[PDB]
Design a protein around this ligand. Structure first.
Ligand SMILES: [Mg+2]
Ligand SMILES: [Mg+2]
Ligand SMILES: [Mg+2]
Ligand SMILES: [Mg+2]
Ligand SMILES: [Mn+2]
Ligand SMILES: [Mn+2]
Ligand SMILES: [Zn+2]
Ligand SMILES: [Zn+2]
Lengths: 827, 827
RNA sequence: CCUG
RNA sequence: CAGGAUGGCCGAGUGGAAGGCAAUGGACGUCCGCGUGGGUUCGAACCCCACU
């Protein structure tokens, strides 16, 4: 049999002894030549259908030889092209001959999904009547045939007869619908058995036709087979069983069997019976009829296996991340930008951590990277875990090199030499390559070379020169496939990519939303939880500056909360102030005003709404911009806010698509908003909450949502410390974490008890929400964090004085977390 | 040389006497068999590349015969498939054998435009190196190869030597870069000439390589050619000339020749000169190299012609109605809807006119149409003129039948029998079929039969059954192709299709525009001329009814002009009134108000804007909708309108895309809008006209723009009556025509002056603008017609009493015409 | 297509 | 799974059109032709492939 050799970072099939050279292969018998050809073609088909690999065959001579014309032609028939170089490249060393196979189709969503077939095959086993001949459908023909089937006569005059005269001349030739057959007397019955499988499917697949057995092909005479040698009823049984044995597939209901008419008619000579003529009429079949199982091969687990008929049809007709697929080029430019003239190390934070922790690692890597002038080196604690494999103790780190004039190399750094190290690195490189093709959709020639290194002071297969990354185009295509693969697993780089995907989604929505600036002066923007409301507000202020040509200090932003204004003010895109500062101080020189989280405002201090109306109207270039962002789902008190009635808040723009939280958090927000819909506060006008998230919208970003009820305070706080330490080990920064509690009065207690457990985990700085620019964790209340967001958020013990306010708290909490959310409720 | 038979409504190629049957073609000499095959294949390739047709062969025998397996296989190679049935169908009667060919690729923009090649070929003459063999690229391979080219070693050790030894073994085998060839024993220079085109193109197309002439293919021994047999310098000259004779096509700058190094090296024998060896190193070539001109054929005029290298490459590497193609399904369902169970005559106005004019025409057509139980019969004065051909006097009408269970038939009706009648009908049917395929992009099997009929007292081919329209899908696909064909010619149905295209464009822009109904309550809609402002106003009231669930009478429409008020009222979508009626009567029962042409309102009667606000913002379901449609380019007077200041007119929508006038009219509108902007009216607020139309927006609808300056009143009126009579003869209704005058005081004068000429033309009814439903030519002033549209507009002597309005009046005139605009300015 |  | 198909007929020829019952396939010394169509070869009846 054929089995993949496991010691390699690639699929490598050993086919054994093969005779190579056309002169040598001409001296073989037909049987042995065909058997060696079949082994090699099974291997090449399997590697084409499974992401590529290497065929290894032992050659019986020492000197370089050519492949042989018959093997060449079989490879050409496999790829349906004379361009062998595109998929097959051969090397030979000593007594070893290697063929390097590229994948046929790469990824779940190739560009050519409707253009080229999913699989290569040795044969499709689909036959078509092609005028007077029967021909087998190549992969492209069969692809088109099934793609068509999936969508939602004088001969009959002869067939109607109940007897035939011996020597009768039929008045029609063989044609698209007619086929005449004659057989020798002794073998007639076995010849019929072998005939049915090749002509019945061809008629069924094409439009039907008549198969006349007992008619001379050339003269069209009726001859039949002698009575003594044929039993009509046994013949009928045999033919019918052969016909029903044919494998049929369906794309419809009802899935009825092949329909045909079988007639065994009498052949009369001089008025006496001589023999029997068999006539089959084959109606056109609704779907595809195979003569047998297709001859297509794939690698699964470790065995080269043959696809079944149904699996083959499924593949020939029909976590993957489409947001990654769509944004791959932008994401690659952001994270894995290829430097022009030096080797880049990423992530820089993880690299610095590793070099600080381990002595001599810097020198080791620098010495190992001398040959590679340009490219990128991507580090990790364990690429194995990054790919959902098992971790190996003793692995300092893994690094993936993607440099010019080199193949991809996966380095594994060990503290001390190990026997299992090379196996671990090989498994990791093999998985990485298979993902780069089968998930990342890479269509080039790719290999990952596994290389173990030891910090304490089988040969590698040589690939053709076409497997080396020759420059920017290849490196960028491979890094975009790497982006798409990383977005399918949980890891530091997959989390950075997910954050950038969220940013790109927000930018799309903002481009849709910013077209209203030229159309409005007064606007009430009703956002939903996690709709980017604040990001739109900032980008709108920038757009106002650019369009109206007014200086930044002429644009004003008003919010309820000090942390939020602090955050907005540090942008230097406008003047930012609070409701109280706004109501107190004078702003006559201000032309444009933006107001956010207005539903949290209060009427105690004064009529901020009227003040802003006046300030904006008295602007010189007509009335200025007065945009009031608000979200009633995130209300923070039962009092009135000073907003005009719901019927007065016009014109309106609604931000309904969730673009700021990953998929789990978004689903949680969607579910939880129904509680607020069920019981809203009385300060909320009734009809406002009848805004619903877009049903067709998803973020396509992975995240973590964990509910950890039934725990005590010290357990919560130790768990938080453990999780933060794990993230910091994986490479996250503290400035990606925030801890949110019910009220600002409990902030001091929870800070103390968090530092009590953090002093065991090597970070001793917790900051309030009023500072967000330093590299430290943020602890604060849910409410004081309104308008801010962090990648990882710890939600501790929701609590408020009034039931009428409690329902909001879960939404106002979960909406603060971009990717990872941990909830610790009371119980 | 082959020629098209001209007596047919199709492309028919008569290839002469052909031997058919496998048993008959097996008895031939190979030369005769191959010559017959070449003739048939040239015909088939030409018909594939030229829209399809028929090949006629004369078969030497009386009885039915299969085509022959070599002919079948050549057709399979031609279409690169075994599905011959899709393109080739064969019939035979007596001593005639027909092959009906379907077009390979049809239409200017096929669905498969970028995936399948435009041409079928007998040979591409493009060769690629495939390991150790040279292979010709089929059509699909050559298509992909040319796309790739269009988008923007141990052998060298031997090659470096300057002498070799007889019997030397070259230490490397043949490979993708190396070819071993022996010299011929007989004719050496001729052999080298023969072999250079076989190998130099393949190396040049596939990365270069080495060709060693004089090296045994099997033993790899150096043999060379005897010294006395060839002369090295003449051999070099012959090789270089053969190389430079190779056709090449470039897709790049510069267009450099083929690059190579040619070496003739002495072949010693025991240290003495015995012979010569030829070494060619062929460098990779930037573009395609042909061994000879491609073997592809096409029907040009009356000749079957071969395509040149450059014509073939252009065809392979790459009026028409884009909007027709985009909306063909909707346009077909509007105009050419095919009913279930009865034959439909269209256009019915033209049909009625024809039967009224001619005695017995109804009887003739109804008699002819008995056989057909379903379909559509499309009449015309002259389908030949519709298709840009020449008219034939004596032709009553042409009808195009498209009925179930029948092929298309073009009928020509003559008053009296004529010899040229059948020729005229055949030429028209040929043009129609070729257009349906090559221009309308029909991909099925199509033939248009040509029949002549008379009102007073070569046999057509019989097409396969697949050429008859089986049912709804075939009839609809064909009618959708006819839609695209018609939209490229100037005719009555083409003008109706253009009107419906403008309606589809308006509906799309309205789908964009109507999203503001949820988001605004007060809206100022600023439309440009021809931007469909009134259509939006009507359709948005239709939407207000559905979205506010109120009855129609709750909506109020207010405009300036009585004709427009009437046109709106007669639709029963709302209550419609005038500004003057509005400012007097009671309307507080109203919830919603839409104001149109508000720029033309006047202040002297009252505060209409104040009344509108007051009525709307006191409705029960909150403030009502108050949308105001205005167009500052279409200002009719220089006084005050009563609108709020431009700085106040928010929120604001803009309709900047012209969707109501054909392309010439729209361009003329833009050119006049430029004049307005250059010299704006003073009563308009300052920044209004800085609205600009969509730069790239086009309607793709053909129209008529004619300016007949320096005419007299008599000439103008006679020309108007003459053009009206021409249109009415062609089939346009009177109610497609409007005659517009500069001022209303001239209306009765010009009514008299018009009837004075029109009574010669057999129509007696004119109408004022206040009746747009009557089937009459509307004569009225530009001012009174503002807000109304008609297909044909006659603009007479436009002018203003106050100079500023001079270009505004021209714009308000032009914008009224949908398709045909005739202007008669001042002398 | 024929024969074992 | 093997073995076949040659000129008028019988039959010899597996890589440089016998013989037998003056010639006794053809197109224009080159080429095609040994069931048909292709391929390799400097060279094919001869080797390879498909088809009948
Ligand atoms: Mg014989
Ligand atoms: Mg023999
Ligand atoms: Mg032959
Ligand atoms: Mg020969
Ligand atoms: Mn048969
Ligand atoms: Mn060779
Ligand atoms: Zn079915
Ligand atoms: Zn070039």
């Amino acid at each position: 049999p054929l089995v993949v050799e496991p010691s390699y970072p690639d699929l490598v099939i050993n086919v054994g002894e093969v005779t190579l050279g056309e002169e040598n292969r001409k001296k073989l018998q037909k049987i042995q030549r065909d058997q060696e050809k079949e082994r090699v073609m099974r291997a090449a088909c399997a590697l084409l259908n499974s992401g590529g690999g290497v065929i290894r065959m032992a050659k019986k001579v020492e000197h370089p030889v050519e492949m042989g014309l018959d093997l060449e032609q079989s490879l050409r028939e496999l790829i349906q092209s004379s361009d062998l170089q595109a998929f097959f490249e051969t090397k030979q060393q000593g007594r070893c001959f290697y063929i390097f196979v590229k994948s046929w189709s790469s990824g779940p969503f190739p560009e050519d999904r409707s253009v080229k077939p999913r699989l290569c095959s040795l044969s499709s086993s689909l036959y078509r009547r092609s005028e007077t001949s029967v021909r087998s459908m190549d992969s492209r023909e069969a692809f088109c045939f099934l793609k068509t089937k999936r969508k939602p006569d004088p001969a009959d005059l002869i067939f109607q007869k109940d007897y035939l005269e011996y020597g009768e001349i039929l008045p029609f030739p063989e044609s698209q619908l007619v086929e005449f057959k004659q057989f020798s007397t002794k073998h007639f019955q076995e010849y019929v058995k072998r005939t049915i499988p090749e002509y019945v499917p061809a008629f069924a697949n094409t439009g039907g036709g008549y198969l006349f057995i007992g008619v001379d092909d050339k003269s069209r005479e009726v001859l039949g087979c002698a009575k003594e040698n044929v039993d009509p009823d046994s013949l009928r049984r045999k033919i019918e069983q052969a016909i029903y044995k044919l494998p049929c597939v369906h794309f419809c209901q009802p899935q009825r069997p092949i329909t045909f008419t079988l007639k065994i008619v009498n052949v009369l000579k001089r008025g006496e019976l001589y023999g029997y003529a068999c006539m089959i009429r084959v109606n056109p079949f609704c779907c595809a009829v195979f003569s047998e199982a297709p001859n297509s091969w794939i690698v699964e687990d470790k065995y080269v296996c043959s696809l079944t008929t149904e699996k083959w049809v499924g593949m020939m007709t029909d976590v993957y991340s489409k947001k990654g697929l769509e944004h791959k080029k932008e994401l690659q430019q952001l994270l894995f930008s290829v430097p022009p003239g030096y080797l880049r190390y990423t992530p820089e934070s993880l690299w610095r951590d590793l070099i600080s922790e381990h002595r001599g690692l810097e020198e080791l890597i620098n010495k190992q990277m001398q040959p590679f002038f340009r490219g990128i080196l991507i580090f990790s604690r364990s690429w194995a875990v990054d790919l959902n494999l098992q971790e190996k103790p003793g692995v300092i780190c893994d690094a993936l090199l993607i440099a010019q004039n080199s193949t991809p190399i996966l380095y594994t750094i060990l503290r001390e030499q190990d026997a299992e190290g090379q196996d671990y690195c090989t498994r990791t490189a093999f998985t990485l390559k298979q993902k780069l093709v089968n998930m990342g959709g890479y269509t080039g020639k790719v290999c990952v070379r596994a290389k173990v290194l030891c910090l304490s002071p089988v040969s590698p297969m040589d690939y053709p020169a076409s497997y080396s990354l020759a420059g920017t185009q290849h490196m960028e295509a491979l890094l975009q496939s790497l982006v798409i693969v990383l977005l399918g697993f949980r890891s530091l780089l997959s989390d950075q990519l997910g954050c950038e995907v969220l940013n790109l989604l927000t930018a799309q929505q903002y481009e849709i939303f910013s077209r209203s600036l030229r159309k409005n002066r007064e606007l009430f923007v009703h956002g939903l939880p996690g709709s980017g409301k604040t990001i739109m507000a900032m980008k709108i202020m920038e757009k106002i500056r650019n369009v109206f040509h007014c200086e930044a200090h002429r644009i004003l932003y008003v919010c309820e909360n000090q942390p939020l204004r602090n955050f907005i003010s540090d942008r230097n895109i406008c003047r930012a102030e609070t409701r109280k500062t706004f109501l107190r101080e004078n702003f006559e020189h201000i032309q444009h005003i933006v107001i956010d989280e207005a539903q949290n405002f209060r009427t105690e201090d004064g009529d901020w709404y009227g003040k802003a109306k006046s300030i904006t109207r008295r602007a010189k270039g007509g009335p200025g911009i007065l945009w009031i962002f608000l979200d009633y789902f995130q209300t923070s008190h039962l009092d009135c806010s000073g907003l005009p009635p719901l019927s007065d808040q016009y014109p309106r723009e609604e931000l309904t698509r969730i673009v700021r939280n990953a998929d789990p958090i978004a689903k949680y927000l969607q579910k939880e908003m129904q509680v607020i819909r069920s019981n809203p506060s009385f300060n909320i006008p009734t009809g406002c909450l009848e805004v619903f998230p877009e049903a067709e919208w998803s973020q396509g970003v992975q995240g973590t949502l964990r509910i950890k009820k039934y725990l005590t305070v010290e357990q919560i706080m130790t768990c938080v410390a453990d999780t933060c330490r794990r993230f910091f080990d994986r490479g996250y920064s503290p400035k990606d974490v925030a801890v949110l509690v019910s009220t600002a009065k409990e902030v001091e207690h929870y800070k103390y008890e968090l530092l009590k457990a953090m002093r065991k985990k090597r970070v001793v700085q917790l900051s309030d929400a009023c500072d967000m620019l330093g590299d430290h964790i943020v602890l604060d209340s849910v409410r004081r964090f309104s308008g801010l967001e962090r990648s990882i958020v710890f939600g501790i013990h929701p609590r408020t004085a009034d039931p009428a306010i409690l329902p909001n708290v879960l939404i106002c909490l979960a909406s603060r977390a971009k990717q990872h959310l941990y909830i610790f409720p009371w119980g």
